[PDB]
Amino acid sequence: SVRLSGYCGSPWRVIGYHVVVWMMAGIPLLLFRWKPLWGVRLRLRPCNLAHAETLVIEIWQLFTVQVQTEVLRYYLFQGQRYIWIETQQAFYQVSLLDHGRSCDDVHRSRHGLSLQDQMVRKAIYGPNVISIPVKSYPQLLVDEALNPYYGFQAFSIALWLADHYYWYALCIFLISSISICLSLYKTRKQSQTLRDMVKLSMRVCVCRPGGEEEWVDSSELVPGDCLVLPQEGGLMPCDAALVAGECMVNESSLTGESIPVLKTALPEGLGPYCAETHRRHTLFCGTLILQARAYVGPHVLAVVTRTGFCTAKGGLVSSILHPRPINFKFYKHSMKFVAALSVLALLGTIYSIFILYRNRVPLNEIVIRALDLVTVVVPPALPAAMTVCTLYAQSRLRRQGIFCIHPLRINLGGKLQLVCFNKTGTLTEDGLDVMGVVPLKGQAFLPLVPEPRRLPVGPLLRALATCHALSRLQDTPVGDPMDLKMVESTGWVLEDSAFGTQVPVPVSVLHRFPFSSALQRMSVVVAWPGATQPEAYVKGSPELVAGLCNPETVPTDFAQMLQSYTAAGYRVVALASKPLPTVPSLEAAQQLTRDTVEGDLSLLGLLVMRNLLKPQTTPVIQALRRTRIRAVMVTGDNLQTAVTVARGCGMVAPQEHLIIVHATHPERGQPASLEFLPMESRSRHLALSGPTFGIIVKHFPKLLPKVLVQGTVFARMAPEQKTELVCELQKLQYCVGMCGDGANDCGALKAADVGISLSQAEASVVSPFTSSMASIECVPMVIREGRCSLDTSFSVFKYMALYSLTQFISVLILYTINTNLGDLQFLAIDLVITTTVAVLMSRTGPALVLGRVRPPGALLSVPVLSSLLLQMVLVTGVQLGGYFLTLAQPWFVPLNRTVAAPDNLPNYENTVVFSLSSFQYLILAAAVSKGAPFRRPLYTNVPFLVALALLSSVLVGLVLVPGLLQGPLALRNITDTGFKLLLLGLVTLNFVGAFMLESVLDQCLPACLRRLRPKRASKKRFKQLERELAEQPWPP
Ligand SMILES: CC(C)CCC[C@@H](C)[C@H]1CC[C@H]2[C@@H]3CC=C4C[C@@H](OC(=O)CCC(=O)O)CC[C@]4(C)[C@H]3CC[C@]12C
Ligand SMILES: CC(C)CCC[C@@H](C)[C@H]1CC[C@H]2[C@@H]3CC=C4C[C@@H](OC(=O)CCC(=O)O)CC[C@]4(C)[C@H]3CC[C@]12C
Ligand SMILES: Nc1ncnc2c1ncn2[C@@H]1O[C@H](COP(=O)(O)OP(=O)(O)OP(=O)(O)O)[C@@H](O)[C@H]1O
Ligand SMILES: [Mg+2]
């Protein structure tokens, strides 16, 4: 639902808002950007929608859009135009302006659009361009800079400049600059990814009225304008309708199919034009026109129907630009985690105030010091660390061949519990092998014919020859693999279509009804010289096409004979025919409606084909099943063929049980029923058809959750039915992945949490995830990358918490003794060590093999907080032990407490505290960076390992080498080598203790947590169902 509110302009209110929010504080700006309804209300007054100059859009969220005026006044929301329809006093989308008009109207527009009426609907519809905003760098820098995080960083820069910490202020500025530039690079890269995809700049003829032509730019086209498509072919600038001609288009860019598609001129009728019904007669935007030819007239004519964001390509671009929110929250209780850190910081700030008071510090100094301590806990490198983590994940995927348009989905990749796969072309090979055709003699089958060439000239041979949709493109037949191989098997050659016998008269296709996956069949009307009347041949599902056949034609053993082949893994389609008494002419043949042709058929035979598993499918499915990720086959193919393939690829193990859930439609006077008939060979799977799925959904809502929870093979599913299944699975708190192929899986790929397409270009719009490899091996790759990304994000958050608390503790320890950490020492710690390490941790790749344990979903967990608390206990212990150890030495000299820092540097206390803490930052970085299960070992990250080794060597030189970096850093020289070695020993103790603490926690905390308090249940609805089925299996 949506709602609109109009806000008429007024200067007094605007200036009042400006002065109030500028003089008062930045807090009102913060709450306005958090609650912008108040901001808009205060800025301007509600007004009648007719005069509104600004609107607020809810869907409940509010987006403020200005109302452009040209009078024609409109507005753009998410790239979609809405104009002011004066008569109705409302804003209607321009997508609906001509919605529902007739095909005869398109054929009338055929003549062209007069230039006086062209500019009108250019204004209403706007330019024909899917325009992605290209921005000046200042605009970006403003967009990131106005982040409140960078506002606090600038406040810190000013605060530390006010205290004469120039190097630390420069350090903060440089780190924030790095973060901002990384964000700019990220946004710029995504924007170019979109723009390069939506590029279009070309000149296209327009059939201007009066019989003349004109070369206008592609962006001057408007719906109702007439195109002249080139004969040699070219890209399509906008959605259109063919009014005259024939076109061979490659719609791979829009839908991912590399098989050429034929487009025919639009029929004439008093029915509503549509891009779904007349998809065959309509060209799309961004699809390539391989070749065009005009049946009648000098040139091929098309009439534009949608432009800009109205087009299907525009809709996909809009969905990419403005994606639906990711419901899953990767980091549970993040606000409470940062609050648990902030409470510790606040207790430390109270301690700081108390001690600074106890040392008789001036009040202004006390407040400045407390503000400094508050700024210490906010790390300037956190945004850079997060951005770099995401960038590294994306780069790793890209190197593996996987492209993601929404990088936020990479983390969902590691959340997957269920992956749905389409069978043909995803699990099994694209190519077929015609194993033979089973003919019929009366009402009985005949032995399979391995070579359909040997068939006698008759209805079955001609049905095989000419029941398809193939087009010779560059002297090579192209089209469906099934059609290609089935025609190849007969020996007839292609040349509205005519076929020459192998060596028996040429056969002509009068009319052809294309294959629709909803119908799962196609048909032709065919005549040959010497033919009494045309004949129609229907090819489609053996089950479905047999229903169209006359009962006396279909043999009594039809189902058993079909199962003989499909249960052996073969793809089978039935061929049926019927004589059409119509005169054998193109005009009369085209008169027939599809429904009349499809029914009352006579079965001719079964075409048996052999599609084999990809060799990469069984390993991947066994790997997924090994890690308790559900593999589900969602296919439009036979149930027996699909079940055989599922057993073959390991979706159903040899020792596991499979039950065929069969639902019967509720006949007259009786209710619907379910039959469960097991078939001979977690451990119990269900296999069911599309009709059964629909019956169970409509009539058995109570049993549907169980069918979904233990259903593995979903056969004979229509595309919308695959989408419905994915949505139903997601209703059970499943994170559903979908590995799809073509138009039959686009809805499921959109609905799925992770949708993957296999044989794709470098950058594609088909699905959120696209890959270049043909196999489904990209699925484990995506899951592994998502798990690595979750683990890396958790490790980076842990390191930033640990680094902050460590700096906080050291600065508190130094405040307690009336000194500080020195200026170039802040610069060193924050820039050289910590930023380097934090931006290098996240470059280590995923583990090579998936595992049964999933990454944690909550930052605020007992393991995480126990780890941080014990790590900080050890850090504080080491620092305070070093401090109380330097006091016991004989050469020690207490600092000049009278003058506060930085006046009293160098001193021994600061020297020791800085050395220990500077080692502890590296120690903590190495500790948080873990390997198995979700990541590779630390030492496989050469930049990170080298940074650790180099920084450790530099710090050891600082501690040992006399006079090294002591002037700059303000370090007190310590001659005693025994104390230096004892400091290094304490550092080694800290390292060993940190690593052993992490190992002990990881190994023994989950078990103690389980024993102490077992989980009563799981909120995952599907896990509740899984357990409930465990006590009582549903099918008895
Ligand atoms: C005073 C010195 C010690 C400052 C230390 C800071 C560096 C460790 C940081 C600052 C920003 C970091 C850079 C942030 C951005 C990235 C991008 C990253 O590559 C990608 O993310 C995508 C690559 C592609 O598109 O193919 C390579 C590392 C790099 C340059 C990082 C390398 C390490 C850098 C230079
Ligand atoms: C007083 C002096 C002697 C001490 C100062 C030492 C630092 C300036 C050195 C020590 C380790 C060095 C870092 C060691 C490793 C790297 C990784 C390098 O980035 C990459 O290699 C990414 C390559 C890719 O991913 O393609 C950027 C430089 C950097 C941060 C170096 C920057 C300078 C550092 C921080
Ligand atoms: N060119 C064609 N002519 C006639 N019938 C066809 C043709 N192509 C497919 N069929 C039949 O229609 C059905 C549709 O299955 P199809 O594979 O197109 O659906 P799908 O959902 O894409 O399946 P998958 O997920 O396995 O790709 C098949 O069972 C097949 O028997
Ligand atoms: Mg398919």
Side-chain angles (χ1 to χ4, degrees), residues 468-473 476-488:
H468 55 79
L470 283 191
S471 56
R472 199 147 277 193
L473 189 70
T476 285
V478 294
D480 210 47
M482 170 189 290
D483 288 352
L484 276 176
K485 304 296 290 189
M486 170 201 96
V487 181
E488 179 175 333

mmCIF file of all heavy atoms in Angstrom, residues 468-488, unseen atoms left out:
data_model
loop_
_atom_site.group_PDB
_atom_site.id
_atom_site.type_symbol
_atom_site.label_atom_id
_atom_site.label_comp_id
_atom_site.label_asym_id
_atom_site.label_seq_id
_atom_site.Cartn_x
_atom_site.Cartn_y
_atom_site.Cartn_z
ATOM 1 N N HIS A 468 8.209 -28.766 -34.752
ATOM 2 C CA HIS A 468 9.220 -28.049 -33.984
ATOM 3 C C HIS A 468 9.197 -26.591 -34.415
ATOM 4 O O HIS A 468 8.392 -26.186 -35.258
ATOM 5 C CB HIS A 468 10.604 -28.656 -34.183
ATOM 6 C CG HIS A 468 11.011 -28.751 -35.614
ATOM 7 N ND1 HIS A 468 11.491 -27.678 -36.331
ATOM 8 C CD2 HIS A 468 11.006 -29.800 -36.465
ATOM 9 C CE1 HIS A 468 11.755 -28.064 -37.565
ATOM 10 N NE2 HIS A 468 11.469 -29.346 -37.672
ATOM 11 N N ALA A 469 10.096 -25.803 -33.828
ATOM 12 C CA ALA A 469 10.298 -24.402 -34.185
ATOM 13 C C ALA A 469 11.792 -24.199 -34.383
ATOM 14 O O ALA A 469 12.496 -23.791 -33.457
ATOM 15 C CB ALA A 469 9.740 -23.475 -33.118
ATOM 16 N N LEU A 470 12.271 -24.477 -35.594
ATOM 17 C CA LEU A 470 13.674 -24.343 -35.952
ATOM 18 C C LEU A 470 13.801 -23.335 -37.079
ATOM 19 O O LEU A 470 12.942 -23.270 -37.961
ATOM 20 C CB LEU A 470 14.277 -25.678 -36.402
ATOM 21 C CG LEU A 470 14.654 -26.742 -35.372
ATOM 22 C CD1 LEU A 470 15.460 -27.820 -36.055
ATOM 23 C CD2 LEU A 470 15.427 -26.155 -34.217
ATOM 24 N N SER A 471 14.875 -22.555 -37.050
ATOM 25 C CA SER A 471 15.138 -21.550 -38.069
ATOM 26 C C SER A 471 16.582 -21.665 -38.517
ATOM 27 O O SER A 471 17.489 -21.690 -37.682
ATOM 28 C CB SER A 471 14.856 -20.144 -37.541
ATOM 29 O OG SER A 471 15.608 -19.887 -36.369
ATOM 30 N N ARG A 472 16.791 -21.726 -39.828
ATOM 31 C CA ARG A 472 18.141 -21.763 -40.369
ATOM 32 C C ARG A 472 18.756 -20.362 -40.243
ATOM 33 O O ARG A 472 18.304 -19.408 -40.885
ATOM 34 C CB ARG A 472 18.123 -22.212 -41.815
ATOM 35 C CG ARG A 472 19.424 -22.711 -42.356
ATOM 36 C CD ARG A 472 19.335 -23.814 -43.392
ATOM 37 N NE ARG A 472 19.195 -25.137 -42.845
ATOM 38 C CZ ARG A 472 19.340 -26.254 -43.558
ATOM 39 N NH1 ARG A 472 19.640 -26.197 -44.848
ATOM 40 N NH2 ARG A 472 19.259 -27.433 -42.958
ATOM 41 N N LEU A 473 19.779 -20.246 -39.403
ATOM 42 C CA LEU A 473 20.486 -18.995 -39.169
ATOM 43 C C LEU A 473 21.925 -19.172 -39.623
ATOM 44 O O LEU A 473 22.664 -19.973 -39.043
ATOM 45 C CB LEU A 473 20.430 -18.602 -37.693
ATOM 46 C CG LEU A 473 20.949 -17.209 -37.338
ATOM 47 C CD1 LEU A 473 20.004 -16.140 -37.851
ATOM 48 C CD2 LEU A 473 21.148 -17.082 -35.840
ATOM 49 N N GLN A 474 22.321 -18.422 -40.649
ATOM 50 C CA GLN A 474 23.651 -18.556 -41.247
ATOM 51 C C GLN A 474 23.881 -19.988 -41.726
ATOM 52 O O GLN A 474 24.907 -20.607 -41.440
ATOM 53 C CB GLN A 474 24.751 -18.114 -40.266
ATOM 54 N N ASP A 475 22.899 -20.517 -42.461
ATOM 55 C CA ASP A 475 22.993 -21.847 -43.075
ATOM 56 C C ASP A 475 23.190 -22.937 -42.029
ATOM 57 O O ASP A 475 23.751 -23.994 -42.322
ATOM 58 C CB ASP A 475 24.133 -21.864 -44.094
ATOM 59 N N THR A 476 22.725 -22.695 -40.806
ATOM 60 C CA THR A 476 22.839 -23.654 -39.718
ATOM 61 C C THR A 476 21.529 -23.644 -38.943
ATOM 62 O O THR A 476 21.118 -22.582 -38.453
ATOM 63 C CB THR A 476 24.010 -23.317 -38.791
ATOM 64 O OG1 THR A 476 25.244 -23.668 -39.425
ATOM 65 C CG2 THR A 476 23.886 -24.066 -37.477
ATOM 66 N N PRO A 477 20.845 -24.782 -38.811
ATOM 67 C CA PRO A 477 19.613 -24.798 -38.013
ATOM 68 C C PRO A 477 19.918 -24.535 -36.546
ATOM 69 O O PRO A 477 20.854 -25.104 -35.981
ATOM 70 C CB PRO A 477 19.059 -26.212 -38.229
ATOM 71 C CG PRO A 477 19.827 -26.783 -39.369
ATOM 72 C CD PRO A 477 21.153 -26.112 -39.362
ATOM 73 N N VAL A 478 19.125 -23.661 -35.935
ATOM 74 C CA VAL A 478 19.273 -23.316 -34.530
ATOM 75 C C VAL A 478 17.915 -23.429 -33.855
ATOM 76 O O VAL A 478 16.871 -23.299 -34.498
ATOM 77 C CB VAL A 478 19.865 -21.902 -34.338
ATOM 78 C CG1 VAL A 478 21.288 -21.853 -34.851
ATOM 79 C CG2 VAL A 478 19.014 -20.863 -35.044
ATOM 80 N N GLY A 479 17.934 -23.677 -32.559
ATOM 81 C CA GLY A 479 16.713 -23.799 -31.797
ATOM 82 C C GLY A 479 16.907 -24.731 -30.616
ATOM 83 O O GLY A 479 18.018 -24.911 -30.130
ATOM 84 N N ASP A 480 15.798 -25.313 -30.182
ATOM 85 C CA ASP A 480 15.807 -26.152 -28.996
ATOM 86 C C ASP A 480 16.700 -27.369 -29.222
ATOM 87 O O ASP A 480 16.728 -27.917 -30.329
ATOM 88 C CB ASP A 480 14.384 -26.599 -28.659
ATOM 89 C CG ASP A 480 14.174 -26.824 -27.181
ATOM 90 O OD1 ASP A 480 14.581 -25.954 -26.385
ATOM 91 O OD2 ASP A 480 13.602 -27.869 -26.813
ATOM 92 N N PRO A 481 17.446 -27.819 -28.207
ATOM 93 C CA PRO A 481 18.220 -29.058 -28.384
ATOM 94 C C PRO A 481 17.356 -30.253 -28.736
ATOM 95 O O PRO A 481 17.738 -31.070 -29.581
ATOM 96 C CB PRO A 481 18.906 -29.232 -27.024
ATOM 97 C CG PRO A 481 18.928 -27.872 -26.434
ATOM 98 C CD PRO A 481 17.656 -27.238 -26.873
ATOM 99 N N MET A 482 16.185 -30.365 -28.112
ATOM 100 C CA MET A 482 15.278 -31.463 -28.416
ATOM 101 C C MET A 482 14.829 -31.409 -29.867
ATOM 102 O O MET A 482 14.859 -32.420 -30.573
ATOM 103 C CB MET A 482 14.076 -31.413 -27.473
ATOM 104 C CG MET A 482 12.937 -32.361 -27.826
ATOM 105 S SD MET A 482 11.476 -32.048 -26.838
ATOM 106 C CE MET A 482 12.035 -32.604 -25.233
ATOM 107 N N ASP A 483 14.406 -30.232 -30.327
ATOM 108 C CA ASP A 483 13.961 -30.093 -31.709
ATOM 109 C C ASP A 483 15.098 -30.376 -32.676
ATOM 110 O O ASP A 483 14.914 -31.074 -33.680
ATOM 111 C CB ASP A 483 13.409 -28.689 -31.936
ATOM 112 C CG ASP A 483 12.070 -28.467 -31.264
ATOM 113 O OD1 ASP A 483 11.488 -29.441 -30.751
ATOM 114 O OD2 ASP A 483 11.598 -27.313 -31.252
ATOM 115 N N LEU A 484 16.285 -29.849 -32.383
ATOM 116 C CA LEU A 484 17.435 -30.059 -33.252
ATOM 117 C C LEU A 484 17.745 -31.538 -33.402
ATOM 118 O O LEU A 484 17.863 -32.048 -34.519
ATOM 119 C CB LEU A 484 18.646 -29.313 -32.701
ATOM 120 C CG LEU A 484 18.766 -27.836 -33.061
ATOM 121 C CD1 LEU A 484 19.961 -27.232 -32.364
ATOM 122 C CD2 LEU A 484 18.877 -27.648 -34.556
ATOM 123 N N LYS A 485 17.869 -32.252 -32.282
ATOM 124 C CA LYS A 485 18.239 -33.660 -32.353
ATOM 125 C C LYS A 485 17.117 -34.500 -32.948
ATOM 126 O O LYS A 485 17.377 -35.450 -33.690
ATOM 127 C CB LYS A 485 18.621 -34.172 -30.968
ATOM 128 C CG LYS A 485 19.732 -33.389 -30.296
ATOM 129 C CD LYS A 485 21.053 -33.492 -31.038
ATOM 130 C CE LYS A 485 21.657 -34.873 -30.923
ATOM 131 N NZ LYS A 485 23.041 -34.911 -31.461
ATOM 132 N N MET A 486 15.864 -34.162 -32.646
ATOM 133 C CA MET A 486 14.739 -34.929 -33.159
ATOM 134 C C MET A 486 14.593 -34.773 -34.664
ATOM 135 O O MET A 486 14.181 -35.717 -35.342
ATOM 136 C CB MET A 486 13.467 -34.499 -32.430
ATOM 137 C CG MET A 486 12.157 -35.027 -32.992
ATOM 138 S SD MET A 486 10.766 -34.013 -32.465
ATOM 139 C CE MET A 486 10.585 -32.911 -33.853
ATOM 140 N N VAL A 487 14.906 -33.594 -35.205
ATOM 141 C CA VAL A 487 14.904 -33.426 -36.654
ATOM 142 C C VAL A 487 16.127 -34.090 -37.269
ATOM 143 O O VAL A 487 16.041 -34.714 -38.331
ATOM 144 C CB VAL A 487 14.829 -31.934 -37.015
ATOM 145 C CG1 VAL A 487 14.807 -31.758 -38.517
ATOM 146 C CG2 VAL A 487 13.608 -31.307 -36.393
ATOM 147 N N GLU A 488 17.282 -33.971 -36.613
ATOM 148 C CA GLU A 488 18.500 -34.599 -37.109
ATOM 149 C C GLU A 488 18.333 -36.106 -37.231
ATOM 150 O O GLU A 488 18.863 -36.724 -38.159
ATOM 151 C CB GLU A 488 19.656 -34.255 -36.175
ATOM 152 C CG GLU A 488 20.990 -34.851 -36.544
ATOM 153 C CD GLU A 488 22.098 -34.364 -35.632
ATOM 154 O OE1 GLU A 488 21.966 -33.251 -35.081
ATOM 155 O OE2 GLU A 488 23.097 -35.092 -35.460
#
